[PDB]
Enzyme design. Structure first.
Site, PDB file in Angstrom:
ATOM      1  N   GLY A 145      -0.386   9.082  -2.003  1.00 36.93           N
ATOM      2  CA  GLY A 145      -0.323   9.867  -0.774  1.00 36.93           C
ATOM      3  C   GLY A 145      -0.011   8.997   0.423  1.00 36.93           C
ATOM      4  N   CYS A 146      -1.035   8.759   1.221  1.00 44.01           N
ATOM      5  CA  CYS A 146      -0.880   8.181   2.553  1.00 44.01           C
ATOM      6  C   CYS A 146      -0.360   6.771   2.528  1.00 44.01           C
ATOM      7  CB  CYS A 146      -2.216   8.230   3.313  1.00 44.01           C
ATOM      8  SG  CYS A 146      -2.792   9.940   3.395  1.00 44.01           S
ATOM      9  N   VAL A 147      -0.821   6.000   1.544  1.00 48.84           N
ATOM     10  CA  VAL A 147      -0.341   4.643   1.302  1.00 48.84           C
ATOM     11  C   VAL A 147       1.185   4.631   1.174  1.00 48.84           C
ATOM     12  CG1 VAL A 147      -0.368   2.627  -0.281  1.00 48.84           C
ATOM     13  CG2 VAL A 147      -2.476   3.896   0.145  1.00 48.84           C
TER      14      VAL A 147
END
Lengths: 198, 198, 197, 198
Positions: A145-147
């Site tokens: 996701g955010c990574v």
């Protein structure tokens, strides 16, 4: 999958100082598996601490990310429809808070986001721009996701991303390694933390 | 854990609609350079889709990777994938494949990074037309498709991933990225389903 | 300007939104960053804001806000040393009471002149499908004009409420309305705007 | 007008290396008073040649801007609602070409936009961040226009702006001088070219 080496993928991203460190949403709701999951996230958070201290010892610009929505769901968005529990990530909610072991210090920047990426509608790019940051080690959750989203943006924004493979974790190991692959093969340098530091 | 932590929530479709075809360009059509896998199929399938949009009046935008002739803007992306340098304006490899050739006032978006939105006018262009839901077709599923999808969500647009209209050079990477997108970033469906519902 | 085709009319177009840029205690009180016609701009905005709520429009407010250790102290805070004093819980940085945010209203926090720069405001407005952005705030030659250009460039039709924007000094106020009128916006008084919308 | 000194506006912005030069929209259309030129633009063009020549031999990063719209008006925006003549700056129209005097060479980036700022919807920001640029000399046209848009974004992007007092140009001296005031006051170091290079 031979196409990748044929068509010239996975070229090494040489490393260049000044360095910086971004930790993405290692926050109480992402560390504790009851709320927003744990595969290897607990392990990743802890190994990251070595990097963080390494960061502060070398005089590295450091940036921490938090997903934060408004208390009245004012900035509720397309993201918070697809994953509804993200709305619950309010400024004072313990769940939205950085984990005690990565607690911010000194002139280290904390960026509040309502999207996956720590650059999207934030001042991350200019903060790093201003500090002349060339290469940026990334850590955090979620790998898939955010990574990754944060990692592709580091790249586009003009920064040499270095993903710490043992400092990012997901709630799901399959996604974890496919997103490491994508990133290795396309968007940055991808190595473990002892390797990076050296 | 994904089910138990609330992921996978339906993302309802909302008019007005638009279509973004990303990097459906000779480079990516042609397996000796950047193509392969299931890219040839999504391109043909996308024709049916591009036709429907034309009949229905939707805003259509096309994406193209374009780097400068003298490598002026050669960047970090260019370093992991040195071949992306070769896609000059006027290199036939950068040209949208003939069979999805633009029309009319369909916007051709020039980019030098994975995503259709990054460092481009795509949000502004779509914003000015008040598009709420964005059909997305293109290559690479695990590459520029996923980057555009995540950014379109981040900018306010509901992403509609046309899962037989997006291709990659490797099936593993293609399935993994579709899974992430359905979970977090988009309504994923086939062209048959999307066209009819819309 | 007329010989080259400038200042064409920019027709108004629903859905409407309203942006209120930096009408904070620091900027309304004349010893801190305020002065000039800013205070009467605040009072005229109240009427607009009230109408926006009744009309069901999307409302955004903006605030300049730096971190409490100055970690995000940037170039803007080299030119204007004071800005760094806008910390989250610093009263100076708080929206003026006349214009307090209600329920669905987005509070955009920034460390640069434009409410659009490194904020989600474009993305928030677009989700809603706002096509025309009414604009109030301080300062006309600062955060307003910067915000007005950016909403234009993000594809929104800026309607500048010339009697709800206010500045330290009349000259810059006037010569920035001029620019906005010539290059960037429908500029008109708040009672025209409320009528034509 | 006293207020500026009392409230602390107008403090010095220290020049910090490495340096970069941005030239905004010195294109035939804006050099030519039938179209978009007039005022002190001609003289801004000529003085610019000295900063450009010094940029080249000093090893400075150089970027040049152009306004360009799509041939079929597909990217007509709000900008060209308000200044419809902008629509005619098409990619191959002489009026859209950088004036011969400031003919770009090298790894000098040319940035194509459809908004006032060189930074908006472009790669310019990521371009300077990769090169580590700290202070950015600016020149161009129009002072009360794309230069002021560019300089405020430069600053926002984490770069130290430096408006070349005699290398920025406008079609009217009133807006020219009003805008140098604001920039001198909130956004940039403002000083002549010789001050600047020395």
């Amino acid at each position: 999958l031979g196409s990748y080496e044929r068509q010239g993928f996975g070229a090494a991203l040489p490393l260049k100082a000044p360095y910086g460190l971004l930790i993405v949403d290692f926050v109480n709701g992402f560390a504790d598996p009851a709320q927003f999951g744990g595969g290897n996230i607990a392990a990743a958070i802890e190994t990251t601490r070595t990097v963080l201290a390494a960061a502060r010892e070398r005089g590295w610009a450091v940036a921490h990310s938090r997903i934060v929505y408004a208390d009245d769901d004012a900035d509720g968005n397309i993201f918070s429809i697809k994953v509804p529990g993200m709305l619950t990530l309010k400024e004072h909610a313990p769940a939205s808070a950085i984990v005690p072991q990565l607690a911010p210090q000194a002139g280290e920047y904390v960026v509040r986001k309502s999207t996956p990426s720590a650059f999207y509608g934030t001042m991350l790019a200019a903060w790093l721009a201003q500090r002349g940051v060339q290469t940026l080690l990334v850590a955090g959750a979620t790998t898939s996701g955010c990574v990754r989203a944060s990692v592709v943006d580091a790249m586009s924004a003009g920064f040499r991303p270095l993903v710490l493979s043992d400092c990012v974790g997901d709630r799901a190991l399959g996604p974890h390694e496919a997103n490491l692959f994508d990133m290795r093969q396309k968007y940055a340098a991808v190595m473990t933390h002892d390797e990076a530091l050296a």
